[PDB]
Every structure is written in structure tokens, then in C-alpha cells.
Short mmCIF file of C-alpha atoms and ligand atoms in Angstrom, two decimals:
data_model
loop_
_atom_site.label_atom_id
_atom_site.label_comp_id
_atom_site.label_asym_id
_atom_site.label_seq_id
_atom_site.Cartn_x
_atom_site.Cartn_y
_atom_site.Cartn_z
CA UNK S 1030 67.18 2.15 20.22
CA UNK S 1031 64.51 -0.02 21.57
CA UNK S 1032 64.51 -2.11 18.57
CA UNK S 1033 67.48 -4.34 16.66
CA UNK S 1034 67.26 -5.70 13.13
CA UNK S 1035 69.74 -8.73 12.64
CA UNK S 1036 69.94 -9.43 9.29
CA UNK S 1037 71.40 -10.05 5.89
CA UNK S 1038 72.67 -7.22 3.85
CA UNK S 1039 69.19 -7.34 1.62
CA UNK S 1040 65.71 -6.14 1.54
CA UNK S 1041 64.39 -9.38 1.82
CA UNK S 1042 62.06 -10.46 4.34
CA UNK S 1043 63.24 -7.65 6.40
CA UNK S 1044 61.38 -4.62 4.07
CA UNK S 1045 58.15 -4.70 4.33
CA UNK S 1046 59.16 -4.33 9.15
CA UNK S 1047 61.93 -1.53 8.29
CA UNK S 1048 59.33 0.53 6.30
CA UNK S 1049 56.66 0.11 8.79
CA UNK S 1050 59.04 0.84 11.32
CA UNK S 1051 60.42 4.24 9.42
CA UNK S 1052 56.92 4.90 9.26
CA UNK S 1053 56.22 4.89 12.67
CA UNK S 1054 58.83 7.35 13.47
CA UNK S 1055 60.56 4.15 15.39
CA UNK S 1056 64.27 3.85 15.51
CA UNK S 1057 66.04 0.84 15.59
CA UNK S 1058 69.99 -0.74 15.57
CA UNK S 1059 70.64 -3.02 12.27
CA UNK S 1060 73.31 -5.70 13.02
CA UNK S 1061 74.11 -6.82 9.59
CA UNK S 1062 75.39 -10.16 9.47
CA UNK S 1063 77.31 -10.79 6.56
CA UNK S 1064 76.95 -14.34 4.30
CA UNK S 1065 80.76 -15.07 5.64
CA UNK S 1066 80.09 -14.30 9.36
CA UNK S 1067 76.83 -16.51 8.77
CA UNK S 1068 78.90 -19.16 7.30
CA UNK S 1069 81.53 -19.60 10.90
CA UNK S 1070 77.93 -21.37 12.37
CA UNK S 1071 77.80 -19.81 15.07
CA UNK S 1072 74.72 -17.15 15.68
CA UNK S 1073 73.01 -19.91 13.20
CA UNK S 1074 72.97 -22.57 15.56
CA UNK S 1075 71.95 -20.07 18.25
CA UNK S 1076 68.92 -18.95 16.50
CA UNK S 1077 65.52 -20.96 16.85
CA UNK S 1078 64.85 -21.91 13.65
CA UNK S 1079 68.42 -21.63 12.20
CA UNK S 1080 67.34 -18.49 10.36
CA UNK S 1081 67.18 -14.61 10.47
CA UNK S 1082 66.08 -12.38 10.62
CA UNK S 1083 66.10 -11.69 14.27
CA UNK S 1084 64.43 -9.01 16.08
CA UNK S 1085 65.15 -8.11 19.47
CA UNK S 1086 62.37 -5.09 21.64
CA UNK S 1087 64.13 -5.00 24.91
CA UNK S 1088 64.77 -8.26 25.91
CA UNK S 1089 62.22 -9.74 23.94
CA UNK S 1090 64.01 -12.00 21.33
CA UNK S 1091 62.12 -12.63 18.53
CA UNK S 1092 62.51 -14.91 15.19
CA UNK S 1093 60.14 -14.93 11.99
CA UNK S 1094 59.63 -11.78 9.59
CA UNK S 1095 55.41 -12.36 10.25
CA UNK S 1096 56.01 -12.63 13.71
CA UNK S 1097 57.92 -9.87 13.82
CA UNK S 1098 55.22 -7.66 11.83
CA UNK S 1099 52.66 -9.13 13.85
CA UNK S 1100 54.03 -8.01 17.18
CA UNK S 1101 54.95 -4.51 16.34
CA UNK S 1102 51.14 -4.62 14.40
CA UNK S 1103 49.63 -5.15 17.90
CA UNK S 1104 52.09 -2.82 20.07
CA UNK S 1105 51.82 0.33 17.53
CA UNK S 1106 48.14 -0.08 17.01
CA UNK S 1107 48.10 -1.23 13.36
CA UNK S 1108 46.27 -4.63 13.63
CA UNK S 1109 42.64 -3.46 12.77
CA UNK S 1110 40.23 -1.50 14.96
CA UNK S 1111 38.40 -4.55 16.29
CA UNK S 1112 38.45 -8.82 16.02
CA UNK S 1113 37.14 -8.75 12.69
CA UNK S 1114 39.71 -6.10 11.25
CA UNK S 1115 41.95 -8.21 12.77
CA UNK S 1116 41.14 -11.33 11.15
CA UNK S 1117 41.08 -9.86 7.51
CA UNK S 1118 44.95 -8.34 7.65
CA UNK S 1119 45.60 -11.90 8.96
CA UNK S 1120 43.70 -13.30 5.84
CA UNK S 1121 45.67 -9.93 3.80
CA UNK S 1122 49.19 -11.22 5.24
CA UNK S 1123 48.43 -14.60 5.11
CA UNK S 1124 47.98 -14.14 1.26
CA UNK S 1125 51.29 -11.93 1.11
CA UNK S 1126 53.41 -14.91 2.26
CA UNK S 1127 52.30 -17.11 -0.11
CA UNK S 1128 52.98 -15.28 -2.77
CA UNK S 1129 56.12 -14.07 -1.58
CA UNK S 1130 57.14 -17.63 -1.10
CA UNK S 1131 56.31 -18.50 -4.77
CA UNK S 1132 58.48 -15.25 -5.42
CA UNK S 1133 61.68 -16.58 -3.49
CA UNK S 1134 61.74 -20.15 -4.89
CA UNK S 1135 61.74 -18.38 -8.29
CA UNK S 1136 64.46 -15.70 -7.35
CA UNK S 1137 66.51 -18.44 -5.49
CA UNK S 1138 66.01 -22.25 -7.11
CA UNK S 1139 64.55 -21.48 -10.80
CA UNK S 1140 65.00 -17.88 -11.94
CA UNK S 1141 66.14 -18.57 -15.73
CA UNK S 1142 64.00 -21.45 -16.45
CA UNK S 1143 60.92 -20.35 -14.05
CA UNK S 1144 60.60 -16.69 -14.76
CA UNK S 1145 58.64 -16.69 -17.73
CA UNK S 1146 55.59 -18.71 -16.29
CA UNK S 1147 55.65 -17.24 -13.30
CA UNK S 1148 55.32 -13.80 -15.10
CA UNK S 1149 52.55 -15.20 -16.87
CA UNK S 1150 50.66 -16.83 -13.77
CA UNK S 1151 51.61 -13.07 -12.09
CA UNK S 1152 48.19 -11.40 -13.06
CA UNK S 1153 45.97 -14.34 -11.54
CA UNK S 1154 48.42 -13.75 -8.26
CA UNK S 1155 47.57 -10.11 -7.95
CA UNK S 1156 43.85 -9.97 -8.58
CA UNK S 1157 42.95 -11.23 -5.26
CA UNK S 1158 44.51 -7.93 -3.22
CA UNK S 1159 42.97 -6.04 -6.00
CA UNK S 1160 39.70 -7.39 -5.57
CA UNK S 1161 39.90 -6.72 -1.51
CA UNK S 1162 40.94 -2.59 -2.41
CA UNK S 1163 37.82 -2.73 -4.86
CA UNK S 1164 35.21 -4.33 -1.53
CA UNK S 1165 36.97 -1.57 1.15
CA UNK S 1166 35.88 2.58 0.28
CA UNK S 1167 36.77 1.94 -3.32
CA UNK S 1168 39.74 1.24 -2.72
CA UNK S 1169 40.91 4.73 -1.81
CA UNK S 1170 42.12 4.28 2.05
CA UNK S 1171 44.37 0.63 3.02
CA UNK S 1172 43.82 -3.04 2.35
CA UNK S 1173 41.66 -3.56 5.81
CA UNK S 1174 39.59 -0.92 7.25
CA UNK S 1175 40.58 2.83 7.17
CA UNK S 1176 43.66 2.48 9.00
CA UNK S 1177 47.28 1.33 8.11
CA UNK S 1178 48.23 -2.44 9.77
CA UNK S 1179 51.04 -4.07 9.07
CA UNK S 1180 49.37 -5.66 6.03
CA UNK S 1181 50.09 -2.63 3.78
CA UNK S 1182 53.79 -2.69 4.63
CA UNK S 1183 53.96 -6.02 3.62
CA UNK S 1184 51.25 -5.80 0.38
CA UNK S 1185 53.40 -2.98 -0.38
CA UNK S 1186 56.88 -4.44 -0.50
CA UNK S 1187 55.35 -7.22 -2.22
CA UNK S 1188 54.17 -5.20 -5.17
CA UNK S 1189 57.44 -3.12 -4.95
CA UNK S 1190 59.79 -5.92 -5.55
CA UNK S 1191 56.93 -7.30 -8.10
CA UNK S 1192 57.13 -3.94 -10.37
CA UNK S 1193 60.57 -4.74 -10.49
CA UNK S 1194 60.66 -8.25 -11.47
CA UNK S 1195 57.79 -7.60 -14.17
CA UNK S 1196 57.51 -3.85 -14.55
CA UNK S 1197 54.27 -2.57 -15.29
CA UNK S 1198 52.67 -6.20 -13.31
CA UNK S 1199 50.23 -3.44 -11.96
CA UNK S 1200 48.73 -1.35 -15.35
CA UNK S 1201 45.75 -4.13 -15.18
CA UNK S 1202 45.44 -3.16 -11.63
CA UNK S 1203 44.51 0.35 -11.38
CA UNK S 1204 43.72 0.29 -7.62
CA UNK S 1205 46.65 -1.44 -6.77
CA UNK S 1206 48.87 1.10 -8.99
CA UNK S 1207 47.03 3.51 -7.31
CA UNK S 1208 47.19 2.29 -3.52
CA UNK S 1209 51.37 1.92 -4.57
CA UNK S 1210 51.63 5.25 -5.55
CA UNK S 1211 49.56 6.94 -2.39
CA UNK S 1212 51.38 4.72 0.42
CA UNK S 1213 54.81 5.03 -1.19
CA UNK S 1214 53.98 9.28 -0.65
CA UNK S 1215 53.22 8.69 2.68
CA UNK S 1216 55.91 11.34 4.14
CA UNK S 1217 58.49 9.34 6.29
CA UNK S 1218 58.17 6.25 3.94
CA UNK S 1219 59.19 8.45 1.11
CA UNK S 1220 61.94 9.82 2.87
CA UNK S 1221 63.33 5.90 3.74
CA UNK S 1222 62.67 4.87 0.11
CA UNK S 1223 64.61 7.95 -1.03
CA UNK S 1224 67.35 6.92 1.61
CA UNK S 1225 70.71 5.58 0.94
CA UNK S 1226 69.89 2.67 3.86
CA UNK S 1227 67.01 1.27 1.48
CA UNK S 1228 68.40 2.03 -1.75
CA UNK S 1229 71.73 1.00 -1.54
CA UNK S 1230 70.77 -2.75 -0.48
CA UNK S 1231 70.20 -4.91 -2.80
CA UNK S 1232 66.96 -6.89 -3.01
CA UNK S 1233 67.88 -10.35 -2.65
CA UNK S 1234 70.97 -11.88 -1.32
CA UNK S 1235 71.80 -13.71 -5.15
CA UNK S 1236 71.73 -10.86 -7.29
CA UNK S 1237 68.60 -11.37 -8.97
CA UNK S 1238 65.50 -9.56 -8.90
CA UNK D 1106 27.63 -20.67 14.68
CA UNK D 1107 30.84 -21.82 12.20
CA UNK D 1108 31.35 -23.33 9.24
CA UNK D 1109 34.39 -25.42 7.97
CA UNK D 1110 34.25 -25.45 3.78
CA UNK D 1111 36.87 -28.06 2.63
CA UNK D 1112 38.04 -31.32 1.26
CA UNK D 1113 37.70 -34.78 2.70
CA UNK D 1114 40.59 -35.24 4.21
CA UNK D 1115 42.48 -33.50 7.48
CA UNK D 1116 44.93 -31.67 5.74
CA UNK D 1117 44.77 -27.81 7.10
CA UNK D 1118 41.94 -27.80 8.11
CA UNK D 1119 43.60 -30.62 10.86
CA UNK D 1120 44.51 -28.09 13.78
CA UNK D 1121 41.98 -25.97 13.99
CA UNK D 1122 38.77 -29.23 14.30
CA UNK D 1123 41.00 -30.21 17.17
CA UNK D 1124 40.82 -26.68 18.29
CA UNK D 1125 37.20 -26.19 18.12
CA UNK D 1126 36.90 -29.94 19.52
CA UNK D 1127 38.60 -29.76 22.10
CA UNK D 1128 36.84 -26.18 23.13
CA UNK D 1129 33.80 -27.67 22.94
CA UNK D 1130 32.14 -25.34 19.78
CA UNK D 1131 29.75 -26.79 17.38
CA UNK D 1132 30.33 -26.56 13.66
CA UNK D 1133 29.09 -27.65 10.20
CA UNK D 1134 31.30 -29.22 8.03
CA UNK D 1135 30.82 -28.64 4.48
CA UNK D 1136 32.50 -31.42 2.44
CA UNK D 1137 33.59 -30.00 -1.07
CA UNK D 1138 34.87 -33.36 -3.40
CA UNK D 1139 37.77 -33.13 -5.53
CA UNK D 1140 35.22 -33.61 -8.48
CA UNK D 1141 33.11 -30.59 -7.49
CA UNK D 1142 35.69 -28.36 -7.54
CA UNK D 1143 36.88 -29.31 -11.02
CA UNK D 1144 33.16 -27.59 -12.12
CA UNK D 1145 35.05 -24.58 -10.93
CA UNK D 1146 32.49 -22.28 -9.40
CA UNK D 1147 33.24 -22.37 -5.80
CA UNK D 1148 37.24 -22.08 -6.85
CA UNK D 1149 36.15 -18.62 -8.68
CA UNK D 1150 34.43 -17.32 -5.78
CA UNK D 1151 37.41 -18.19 -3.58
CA UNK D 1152 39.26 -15.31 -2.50
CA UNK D 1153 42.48 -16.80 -2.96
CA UNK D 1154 41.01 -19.97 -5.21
CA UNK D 1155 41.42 -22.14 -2.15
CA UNK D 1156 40.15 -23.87 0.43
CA UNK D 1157 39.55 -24.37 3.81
CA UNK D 1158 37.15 -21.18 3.61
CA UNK D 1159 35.08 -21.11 6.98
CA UNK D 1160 32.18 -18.78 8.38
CA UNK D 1161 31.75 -17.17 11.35
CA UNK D 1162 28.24 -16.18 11.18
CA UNK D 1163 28.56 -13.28 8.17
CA UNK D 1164 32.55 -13.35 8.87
CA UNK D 1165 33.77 -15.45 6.20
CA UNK D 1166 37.33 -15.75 6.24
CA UNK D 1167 40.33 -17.67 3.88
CA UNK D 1168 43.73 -19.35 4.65
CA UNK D 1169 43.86 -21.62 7.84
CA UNK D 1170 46.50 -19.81 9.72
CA UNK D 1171 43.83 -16.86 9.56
CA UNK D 1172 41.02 -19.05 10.83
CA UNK D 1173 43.63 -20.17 13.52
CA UNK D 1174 44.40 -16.84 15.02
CA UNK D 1175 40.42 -15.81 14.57
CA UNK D 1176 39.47 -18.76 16.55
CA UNK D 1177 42.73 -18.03 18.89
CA UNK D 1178 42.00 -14.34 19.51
CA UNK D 1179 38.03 -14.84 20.25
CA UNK D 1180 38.31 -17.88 22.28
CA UNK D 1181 41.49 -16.52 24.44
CA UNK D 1182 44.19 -19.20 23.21
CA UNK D 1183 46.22 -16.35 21.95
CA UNK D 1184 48.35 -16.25 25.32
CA UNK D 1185 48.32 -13.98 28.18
CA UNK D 1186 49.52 -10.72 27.13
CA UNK D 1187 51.45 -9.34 23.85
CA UNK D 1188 54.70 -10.80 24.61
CA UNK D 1189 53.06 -14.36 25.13
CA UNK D 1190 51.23 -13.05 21.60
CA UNK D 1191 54.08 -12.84 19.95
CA UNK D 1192 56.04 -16.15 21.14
CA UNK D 1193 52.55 -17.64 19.89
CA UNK D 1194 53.12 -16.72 16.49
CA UNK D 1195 56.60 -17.51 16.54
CA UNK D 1196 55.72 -21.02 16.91
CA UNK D 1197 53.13 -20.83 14.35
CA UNK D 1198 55.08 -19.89 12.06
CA UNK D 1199 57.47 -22.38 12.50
CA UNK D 1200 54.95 -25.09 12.24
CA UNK D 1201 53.78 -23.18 9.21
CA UNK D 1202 57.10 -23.48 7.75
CA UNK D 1203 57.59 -27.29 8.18
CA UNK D 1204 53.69 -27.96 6.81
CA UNK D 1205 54.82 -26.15 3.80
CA UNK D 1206 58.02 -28.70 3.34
CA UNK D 1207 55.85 -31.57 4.88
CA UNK D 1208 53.04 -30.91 2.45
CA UNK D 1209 55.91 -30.05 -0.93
CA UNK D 1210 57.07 -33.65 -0.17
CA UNK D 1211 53.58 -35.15 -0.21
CA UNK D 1212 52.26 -33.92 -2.90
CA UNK D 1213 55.39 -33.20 -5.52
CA UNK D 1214 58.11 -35.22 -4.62
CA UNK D 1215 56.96 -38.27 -2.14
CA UNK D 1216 59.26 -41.20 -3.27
CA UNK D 1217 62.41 -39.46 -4.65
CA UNK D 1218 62.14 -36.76 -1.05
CA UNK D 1219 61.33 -38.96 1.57
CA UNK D 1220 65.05 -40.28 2.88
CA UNK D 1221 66.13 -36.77 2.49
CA UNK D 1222 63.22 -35.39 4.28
CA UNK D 1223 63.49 -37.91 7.25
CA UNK D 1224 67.09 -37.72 7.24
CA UNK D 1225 66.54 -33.70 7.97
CA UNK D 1226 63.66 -34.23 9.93
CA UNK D 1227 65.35 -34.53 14.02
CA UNK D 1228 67.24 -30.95 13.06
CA UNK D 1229 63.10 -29.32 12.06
CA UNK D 1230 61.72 -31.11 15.41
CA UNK D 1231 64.82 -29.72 17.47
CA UNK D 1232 63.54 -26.02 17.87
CA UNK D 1233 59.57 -27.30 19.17
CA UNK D 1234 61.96 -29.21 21.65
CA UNK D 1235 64.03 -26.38 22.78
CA UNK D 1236 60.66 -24.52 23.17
CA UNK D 1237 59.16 -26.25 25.68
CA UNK D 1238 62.15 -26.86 26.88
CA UNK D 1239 62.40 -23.32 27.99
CA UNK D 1240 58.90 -22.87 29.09
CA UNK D 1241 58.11 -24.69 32.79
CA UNK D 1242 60.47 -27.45 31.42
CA UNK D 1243 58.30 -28.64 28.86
CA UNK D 1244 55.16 -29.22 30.82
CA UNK D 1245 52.65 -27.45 29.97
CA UNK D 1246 51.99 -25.88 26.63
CA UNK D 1247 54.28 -24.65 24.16
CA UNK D 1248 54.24 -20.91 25.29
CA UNK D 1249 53.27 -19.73 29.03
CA UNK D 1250 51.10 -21.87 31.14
CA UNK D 1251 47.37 -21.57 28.79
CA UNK D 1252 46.78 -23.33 25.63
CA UNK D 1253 46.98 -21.55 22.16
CA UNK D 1254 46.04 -22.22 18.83
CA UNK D 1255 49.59 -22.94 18.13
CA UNK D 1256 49.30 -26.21 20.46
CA UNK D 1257 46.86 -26.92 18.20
CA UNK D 1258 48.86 -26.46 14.64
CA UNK D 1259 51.93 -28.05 17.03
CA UNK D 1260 50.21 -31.06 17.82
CA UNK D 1261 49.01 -31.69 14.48
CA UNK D 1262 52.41 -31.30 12.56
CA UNK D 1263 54.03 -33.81 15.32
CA UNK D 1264 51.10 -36.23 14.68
CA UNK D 1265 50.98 -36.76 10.95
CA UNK D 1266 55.21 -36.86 11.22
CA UNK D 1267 54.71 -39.88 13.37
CA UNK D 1268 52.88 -41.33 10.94
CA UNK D 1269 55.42 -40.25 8.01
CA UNK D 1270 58.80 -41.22 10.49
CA UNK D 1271 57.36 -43.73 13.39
CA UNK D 1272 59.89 -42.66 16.24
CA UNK D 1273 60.87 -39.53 15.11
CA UNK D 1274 59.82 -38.15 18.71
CA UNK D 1275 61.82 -40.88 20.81
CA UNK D 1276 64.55 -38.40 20.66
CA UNK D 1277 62.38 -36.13 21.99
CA UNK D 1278 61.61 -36.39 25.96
CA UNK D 1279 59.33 -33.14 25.63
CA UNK D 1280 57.52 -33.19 22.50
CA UNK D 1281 56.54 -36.66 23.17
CA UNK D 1282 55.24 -36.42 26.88
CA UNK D 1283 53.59 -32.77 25.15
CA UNK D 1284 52.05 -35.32 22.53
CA UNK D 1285 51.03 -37.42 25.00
CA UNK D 1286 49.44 -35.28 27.66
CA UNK D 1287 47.46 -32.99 25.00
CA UNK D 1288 46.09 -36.27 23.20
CA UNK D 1289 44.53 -37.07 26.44
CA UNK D 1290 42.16 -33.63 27.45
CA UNK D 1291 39.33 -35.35 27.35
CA UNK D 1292 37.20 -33.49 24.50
CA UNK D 1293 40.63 -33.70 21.88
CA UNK D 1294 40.80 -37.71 22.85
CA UNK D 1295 37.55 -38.23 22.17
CA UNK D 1296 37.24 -36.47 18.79
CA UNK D 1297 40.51 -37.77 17.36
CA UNK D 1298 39.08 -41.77 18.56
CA UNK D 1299 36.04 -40.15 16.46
CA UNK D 1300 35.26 -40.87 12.80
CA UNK D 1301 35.00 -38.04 11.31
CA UNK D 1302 39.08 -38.05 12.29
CA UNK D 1303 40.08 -41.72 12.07
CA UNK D 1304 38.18 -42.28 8.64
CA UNK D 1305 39.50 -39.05 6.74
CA UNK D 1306 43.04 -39.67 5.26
CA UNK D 1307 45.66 -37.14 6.34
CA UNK D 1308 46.37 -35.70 2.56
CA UNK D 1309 44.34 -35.67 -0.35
CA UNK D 1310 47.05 -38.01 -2.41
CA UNK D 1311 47.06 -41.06 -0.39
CA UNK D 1312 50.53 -40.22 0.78
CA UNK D 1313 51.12 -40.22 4.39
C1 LIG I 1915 68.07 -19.33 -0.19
O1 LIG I 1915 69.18 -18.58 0.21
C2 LIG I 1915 68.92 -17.32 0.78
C3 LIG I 1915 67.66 -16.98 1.26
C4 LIG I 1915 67.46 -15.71 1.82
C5 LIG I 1915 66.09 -15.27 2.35
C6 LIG I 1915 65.35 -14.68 1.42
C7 LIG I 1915 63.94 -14.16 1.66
O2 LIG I 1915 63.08 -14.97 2.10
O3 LIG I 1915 63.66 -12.97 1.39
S1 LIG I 1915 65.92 -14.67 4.01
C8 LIG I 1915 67.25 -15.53 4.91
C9 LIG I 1915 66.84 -16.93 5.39
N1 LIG I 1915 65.72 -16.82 6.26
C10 LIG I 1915 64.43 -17.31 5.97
O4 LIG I 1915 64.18 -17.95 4.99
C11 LIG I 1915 63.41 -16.97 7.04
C12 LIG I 1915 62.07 -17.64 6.81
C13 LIG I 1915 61.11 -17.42 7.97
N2 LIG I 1915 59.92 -18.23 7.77
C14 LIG I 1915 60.74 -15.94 8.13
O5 LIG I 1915 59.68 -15.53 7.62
O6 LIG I 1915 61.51 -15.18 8.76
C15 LIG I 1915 68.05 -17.50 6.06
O7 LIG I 1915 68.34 -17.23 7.18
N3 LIG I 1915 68.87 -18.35 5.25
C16 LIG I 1915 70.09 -18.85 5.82
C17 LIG I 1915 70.05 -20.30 6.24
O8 LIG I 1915 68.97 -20.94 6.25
O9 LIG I 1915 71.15 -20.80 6.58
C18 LIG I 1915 68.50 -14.79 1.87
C19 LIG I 1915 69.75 -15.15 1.39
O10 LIG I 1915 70.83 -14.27 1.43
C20 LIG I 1915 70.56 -12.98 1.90
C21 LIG I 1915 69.95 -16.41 0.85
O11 LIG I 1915 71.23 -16.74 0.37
C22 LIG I 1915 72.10 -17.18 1.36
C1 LIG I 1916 48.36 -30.01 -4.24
O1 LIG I 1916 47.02 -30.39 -4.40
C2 LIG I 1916 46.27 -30.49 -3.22
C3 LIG I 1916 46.60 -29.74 -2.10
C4 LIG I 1916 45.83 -29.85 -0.94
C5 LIG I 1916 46.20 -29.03 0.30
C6 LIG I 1916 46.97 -29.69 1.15
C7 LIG I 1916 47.47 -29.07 2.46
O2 LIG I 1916 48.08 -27.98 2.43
O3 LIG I 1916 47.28 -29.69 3.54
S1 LIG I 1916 44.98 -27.97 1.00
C8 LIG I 1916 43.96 -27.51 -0.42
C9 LIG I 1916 44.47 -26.28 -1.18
N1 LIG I 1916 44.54 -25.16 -0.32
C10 LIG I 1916 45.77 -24.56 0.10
O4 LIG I 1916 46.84 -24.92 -0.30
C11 LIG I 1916 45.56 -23.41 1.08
C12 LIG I 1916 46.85 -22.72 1.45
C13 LIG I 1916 46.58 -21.49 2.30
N2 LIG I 1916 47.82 -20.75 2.44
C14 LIG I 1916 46.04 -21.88 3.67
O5 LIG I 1916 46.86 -22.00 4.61
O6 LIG I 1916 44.80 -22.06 3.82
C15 LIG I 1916 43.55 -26.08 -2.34
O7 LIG I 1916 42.54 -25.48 -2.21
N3 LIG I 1916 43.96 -26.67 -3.58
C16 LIG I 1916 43.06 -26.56 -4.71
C17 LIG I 1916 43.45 -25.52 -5.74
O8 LIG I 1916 44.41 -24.74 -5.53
O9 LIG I 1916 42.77 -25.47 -6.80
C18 LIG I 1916 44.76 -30.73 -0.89
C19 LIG I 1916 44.44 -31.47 -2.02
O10 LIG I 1916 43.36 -32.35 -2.01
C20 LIG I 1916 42.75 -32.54 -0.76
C21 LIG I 1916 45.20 -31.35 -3.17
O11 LIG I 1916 44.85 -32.11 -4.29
C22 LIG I 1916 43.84 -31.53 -5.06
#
């Protein structure tokens, strides 16, 4: 395949790329790297930032789940239809990241002690991609514009993982719920949700979710 | 035509003035005070209830890696072709990550954090090293042979971790010659000698 996933045994950071790539009718190798292998030192040291994943498109090495979602946004043509598309699913992905940041520190560093205000704070988390479905065609097409960019994949996994750690997060969000519901139909995603290669991994790497 | 909406101090929005500085665009800034945004209104009408928010014309646009890669992608600083693209934001997001620990050990945990931090700091320098490193032997810019918005966002992190760690680039042939040389283009010397730099505090806690 032109593309190679080096990763973890998880979901993780990796998600949101594999379902855009499943998507796309793109295959790609996964090299999992298991927490032992990790732990010998040596493909950590090699990588940039000490860190996977790591994505590799020919001999183009790459490191950094945006960067990787970012690159195959701009090569398979889902990075807005002009400059200003472009800008808002950076401002959309941007706004992903931070949230899923506040997400791993809980799962990871404070799950039992954190979980409960963090639930509560959820809503207030939410309402801004809600509020961006509600100012594009109702809400009734994608997050930017009327075409997928790598945005939804990662808005998507982000409220996926979020209906698990506080199910029903998205009954005050009936756009959201809705947008969920229509992208997770999408034919090829389906089938990949449905598949034993997403299903069978767990989440996070700690058992939590 | 643009319109920076922020704090008084540099913070985040730090890269991208030196950006539109050095490029030679005008811009308004639009100071927002700590005490006006306890009134709340302009938080509420945030998208994300932050700042920097910044206009470009009837483009208004949130989070300052966003307002990065806007300025980066209409002003050509987003390399030369997608591959170039792509190491661009692989550097951004590095700097990205270490402004997120930088900025946790400002504001949440200054005076227990700091030996740890600066004890683990030469190890989150290393990779910008090894970058340039790898690119024309470190001198030029920090991907390809044009300047990007991440030299910007890379120049800034490198700056206010001198000021945090004084010498934490001697170890660093490359990042401090890259310091160096990009301090001196002309336009970026003269705005960061200016005051509107040199008389805003780097963070909005006193901590630097
Ligand atoms: C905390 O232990 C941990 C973390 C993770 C990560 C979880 C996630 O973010 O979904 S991913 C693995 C981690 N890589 C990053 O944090 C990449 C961040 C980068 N900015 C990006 O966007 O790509 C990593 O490589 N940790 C290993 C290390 O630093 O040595 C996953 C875990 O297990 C699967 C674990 O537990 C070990
Ligand atoms: C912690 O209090 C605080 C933080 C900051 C920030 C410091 C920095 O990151 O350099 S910026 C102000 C902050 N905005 C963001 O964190 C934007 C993040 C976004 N992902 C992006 O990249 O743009 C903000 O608006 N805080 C106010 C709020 O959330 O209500 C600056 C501060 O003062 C200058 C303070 O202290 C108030």
C-alpha cells in the first residue's frame, strides 16, 4: 500500500486518519508497535518527537496525528473548496485538539477523581461544533462547507469516543446527534466501524474509556 | 485589512505579529483587559470563549494556529509544494505541543515545575535541532529554502525559553545561529526593538 500506520494497538489519535482513510477507499499497512517493543527504546529515539504515531506515503515520513490529517486533507481534496473553507476546518480541527487533549489528561492522569467535572463541563465543550452545524445549511451537510475535510473525521471520532465516556453527551445536541448518525452511515465508514480491525481495538492504551 | 482581538501581553498571539511584521501588513490591534472580559460579553460571543480572535475583512477566524496557517496559506509561507506543506505542519505542531507544556507550567504550576521543566527542556529543543539539521544544514529556515509561518511559531517558542532557561540554546549550534539570523530581517528586528513588543509582558501572570 502507499500508506503505513505505525502505531499503538488503540484507536487513539490514530481514528479519526484510519476512518478517513477507509473512507477514501485508501489502503494502507498498520505496523503495530506493541507497549513492550516501544519500551527496548529504540524506534522511540528514532522518531522526531519521541512519539507515534508515524505515517509514512512513499518515502515521505511523517510524525503528528494533525499533520498527518492535514496532509492527506490537502492530497485527497478534503481541505475546503477555497482559502476561506480552508481556514474554518483549521479553526474546526483546531477546536477538536483541544478538547481531545482535555479528554486524554482525564483518561490518562485523573480518570477517577476528574471524571465527574469533566462530565459536567462536557455540554459547554460541545456547544461550540454545535453552534458551527446550526450557521452551515442547517446543519444538514459537514462541519465546513458542503464537502467532507478531514475535520469531520476528526469531529466525528471525537464525539464517538465522547458518547462513550458520557453516553447520551449528545441528546442536548440534536444536530450533532444527527450529523453522528448520517456520517457514521456513510457506506465504507460503516463497513470499517462494523469491522473487526476497529472494533476489536481498544480505545485507549490504559483501559479506560 | 486585519484585526488582532486579544490581551495585553504576547502570549499567542506572539508568532503571528512577528509574522505580519516582518511581511510588512498593517493591522489593528484591539486590546481586550483582563477586567473587560470578566463583564463576559465578548467571552459569550467567542466561538470557542477565547481569545486571540482576528478579522480578515468579514473572515473572522478563532484559535492562533488557525490564524497562523490563514496568514501562511494567503501570504505563501506555507512552503513550496504539499510535501514542504506537510513538513510545515509537522513543525507546528511540535511547537504547538511544547507551548501547551510551556504555557501549563506558567500558568498552573510555575514554582513547584520549573527544575523539572528545565531539566527536560534540551531533550524538547533536540528535535527543532535535528530539523534544521537536515534541511541545507541548518541555514536557512526550518523546512525548504522559503520562510513559513512555522519559523514564525519556531522563533517565538525559542525566544520566550531563553528568557525562562538563559542558555538553553548554547547546546544548540543551529537553533541559535537560526535565532540569530531570523532576529535580524530587517522588518522582524525592528518590530521586536519596538514597543508595542518590548513593553508587553510575555504571559498574562507575570511569570516568564
Ligand atoms: C500517556 O500514555 C499513553 C498515551 C497514549 C496516546 C494517547 C492519545 O493521545 O490518544 S498516543 C501515544 C503517544 N503519542 C502522542 O501523545 C502524540 C501526540 C502528538 N502531538 C500527535 O498528535 O501525534 C506516545 O507515543 N506515547 C509514548 C511516549 O511518549 O513514550 C497512548 C498510550 O498507549 C497506547 C499511552 O500509554 C503508554
Ligand atoms: C490561564 O489563564 C490565561 C491564559 C492565557 C493564554 C495564554 C497562552 O496560551 O499564551 S491565551 C488566552 C486564552 N486563550 C487560549 O488559551 C486560546 C487557545 C487556543 N487553542 C488558541 O490556540 O488560540 C483565553 O482566552 N483565556 C480566557 C478564558 O478562557 O476565559 C492568557 C491569560 O491572560 C493574558 C490568562 O489569564 C487570564
Amino acid at each position: 500500500p502507499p500508506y503505513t500506520v505505525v502505531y499503538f494497538p488503540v484507536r487513539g489519535r490514530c481514528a479519526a486518519l484510519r476512518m478517513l482513510l477507509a473512507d477514501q477507499g485508501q489502503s494502507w499497512k498498520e505496523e503495530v508497535v506493541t507497549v513492550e517493543t516501544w519500551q527496548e527504546g529504540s524506534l522511540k529515539a528514532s522518531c522526531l518527537y519521541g512519539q507515534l504515531p508515524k505515517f509514512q506515503d512513499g518515502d515521505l515520513t511523517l510524525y503528528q496525528s494533525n499533520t498527518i490529517l492535514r496532509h492527506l486533507g490537502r492530497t485527497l481534496g478534503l481541505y475546503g473548496k477555497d482559502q476561506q473553507e480552508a481556514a474554518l476546518v483549521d479553526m474546526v480541527n483546531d477546536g477538536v485538539e483541544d478538547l481531545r487533549c482535555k479528554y486524554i489528561s482525564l483518561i490518562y492522569t485523573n480518570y477517577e477523581a476528574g471524571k465527574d467535572d469533566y462530565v459536567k463541563a462536557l455540554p459547554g465543550q460541545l456547544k461550540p461544533f454545535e453552534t458551527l452545524l446550526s450557521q452551515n445549511q442547517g446543519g444538514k451537510t459537514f462541519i465546513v462547507g458542503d464537502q467532507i475535510s478531514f475535520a469531520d473525521y476528526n469531529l466525528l471520532d471525537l464525539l464517538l469516543i465522547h458518547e462513550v465516556l458520557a453516553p447520551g453527551c449528545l441528546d442536548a445536541f440534536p444536530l450533532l446527534s444527527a450529523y453522528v448518525g448520517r456520517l457514521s452511515a456513510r457506506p465504507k465508514l460503516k463497513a470499517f466501524l462494523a469491522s473487526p480491525e476497529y472494533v476489536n481495538l481498544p480505545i485507549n492504551g490504559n483501559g479506560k474509556q
